[PDB]
Amino acid sequence: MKFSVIVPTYNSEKYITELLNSLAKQDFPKTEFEVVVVDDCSTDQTLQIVEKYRNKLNLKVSQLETNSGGPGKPRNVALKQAEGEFVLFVDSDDYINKETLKDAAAFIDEHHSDVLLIKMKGVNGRGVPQSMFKETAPEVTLLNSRIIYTLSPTKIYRTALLKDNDIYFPEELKSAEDQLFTMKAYLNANRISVLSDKAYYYATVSPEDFYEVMRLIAVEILNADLEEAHKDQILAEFLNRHFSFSRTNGFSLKVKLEEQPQWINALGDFIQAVPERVDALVMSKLRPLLHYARAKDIDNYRTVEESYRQGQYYRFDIVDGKLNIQFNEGEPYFEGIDKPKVKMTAFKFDNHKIVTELTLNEFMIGEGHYDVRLKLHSRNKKHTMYVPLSVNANKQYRFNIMLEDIKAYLPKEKIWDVFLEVQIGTEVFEVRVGNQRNKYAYTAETSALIHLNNDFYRLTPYFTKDFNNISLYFTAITLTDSISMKLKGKNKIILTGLDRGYVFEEGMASVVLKDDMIMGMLSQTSENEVEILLSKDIKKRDFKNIVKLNTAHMTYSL
């Protein structure tokens, strides 16, 4: 055979039908795949609905003598019963696509994959991460990709890869038992593949056993058949993920103060299993958690997290976007802790204002103790412009760049670079924003009209070619050469942007003649067109005498 579907079931009567159908609707030969469903001793008509697919699917039903309490053992007993060339672990609450086994079998015969990663899609609001399923790579490792950011068994593994190297689910450890199964596959797979052509997989205690599994992963990486420099970098990105997205992230804040001695000890043996040379590779804000984990000093560990949330430190000084923190009278100085990273999460504008939203992802300092201002620096480093913070929420700072405020300053230069100024007392940081951002919500070269001294200019936001950073292009134009004015119907004025697009502020509008004016409603139909739904009909001979044209906050005389 080719595949072998393993399904851990436990009290899944109300939704096993959604999975047994996906396996039946499979666009794949029935003789080249099987479904091994081992039950964890259910108390409902679960096997009785599975047996409704014995004729539609090659089936191997098994049931444990007693309940195990997790998908660990049901997947292991089914792993010994699997006779196919590959395995696919699917929980009973999930389902797959109709062409999942078809596209996977072809992808195997072309790249000869040992571990295959299919892109997942979340239903009913389930994540399911995405940082590794943006492209289709026939070969990845734990450094050049993000496969280390997903460790669930919802992937495709080679049966010989897991049986020869002895890779089974730890039955005794019911806490995150899956993270060891995948990491053992990642370190022992000669080639790891990521498939991302469509949506394939559709998903729906004492900290002792948890921190033991983490220690097992740190040991498997150090003892794998890889280069020593690569072993700690793989272990570093694993600590980059554990201390940021697992339950360890801030346990001294949430876990009861009575049970924190139980946490710091179990976590202590995990970090003690990681060499102290790896601390230079993990994220700099995690090193104070790595030192206080080995020493098992919970009091000094609870303070490091409390010093991060509220941004209060006992003693500190800054050396270029990186601080040197002393969390207590006598504790050592952690140096090289982190210029703050800036990502432009939003960018909207028109002929009235410019609304940007810069978000500070990695800023160790707490919010409120530092002041930020948006800097608009010229290319020749002569003129600049500072726009204050309009409103902020957490580390999302929104600036409202009103054009009327900066109209009399743009004609100084044609290239206005957009920096973000960060200041803490007397230390001013100059971060160039642009290279990290979301998808630009406009078409390229989309400018906005600016009237100034009976002349017309266009403020063109664009990204530089060097480092993809955003700037503002301010140059003089001619109206009749950029935007055409036509009369659609008898109560609509269409402004069509010829060479480029021109966005404008939607809402109320007003056109003016020598002796009459008509009110209208402006609305952006497309990126290079604008409709003005007027109140009364304007005759075409009156359309030739449009003296002035205003918006809801800006005016333009013809």
Burial (CB count within 10 angstroms: exposed 0-12, middle 13-18, buried 19+), residue 25: middle
Write down the residue that tokens 């960060």 correspond to.
Answer: 422
Q: Which is nearer to its own copies, 194 or 518 (CB)?
A: 518
For residue 323, the minimal CB distance to its own copies (Å) is: 12
Of 373, 369, 433, 415, nearest in space to 397 by CA: 373
CA atoms within 13 A on the CB side of 391: 3
Q: Which is nearer to its own copies, 221 or 422 (CB)?
A: 422
Which of 39, 40, 178, 279 does the annotation list as catalytic?
178
Of 61, 74, 59, nearest in space to 24 by CA: 59
Catalytic residue check, 91:
no
Dihedral pair phi/psi, residue 498, rounded to 5° = -65, -75
Q: Which is nearer to its own copies, 34 or 357 (CB)?
A: 357
Distance CA 88, CA 154 (A): 7
For residue 387, the minimal CB distance to its own copies (Å) is: 6
Q: Which is nearer to its own copies, 161 or 325 (CB)?
A: 325
Q: Which is nearer to its own copies, 56 or 383 (CB)?
A: 383
Distance CA 537, CA 486 (A): 14
CB 282 within 8 A of CB 237: no
Q: Which is nearer to its own copies, 1 or 512 (CB)?
A: 512
Q: Which is nearer to its own copies, 221 or 403 (CB)?
A: 403
For residue 243, the minimal CB distance to its own copies (Å) is: 19
Alpha-carbon dihedral 138, 143, 147, 152, rounded to 10 degrees: 130
Give the chain's radius of gyration (CA, Å). 31
For residue 217, the minimal CB distance to its own copies (Å) is: 30
Tokens of 224: 């794998």
Contacting residues toward its own copies, per CB under 8 A:
318, 346, 357, 367-369, 383-394, 396, 398, 400, 402, 405-406, 408-409, 412, 421, 423, 426, 428, 489, 491, 506-508, 510, 512, 515-521, 523, 533-536, 548, 550, 552-553, 555
- Straight-line distance from the first to the last Cα atom of the chain, in angstroms, rounded to the nearest whole number: 77
DSSP 438-475: ---SS-TT-BEEEEETTEEEEEEEEE-TTT--EEEEEE
The sheet with strand 334-337 has its strands ordered as 315-318, 323-326, 334-337
Tokens of 307: 């010093």
Q: Which is nearer to its own copies, 167 or 512 (CB)?
A: 512
CA dihedral over 38, 44, 48, 52, signed as positive or negative: negative
* Beta strand 33-39 pairing with 3-9: parallel
For residue 76, the minimal CB distance to its own copies (Å) is: 40
Distance CA 444, CA 451 (A): 22
Tokens of 411: 């004609």
Dihedral pair phi/psi, residue 420, rounded to 5° = -120, 120
For residue 512, the minimal CB distance to its own copies (Å) is: 5
For residue 557, the minimal CB distance to its own copies (Å) is: 10
341 contacts: CB under 8 Å, gap ≥ 6: 360, 361, 362, 363, 436
For residue 42, the minimal CB distance to its own copies (Å) is: 37
- Residues marked active site are found at 178
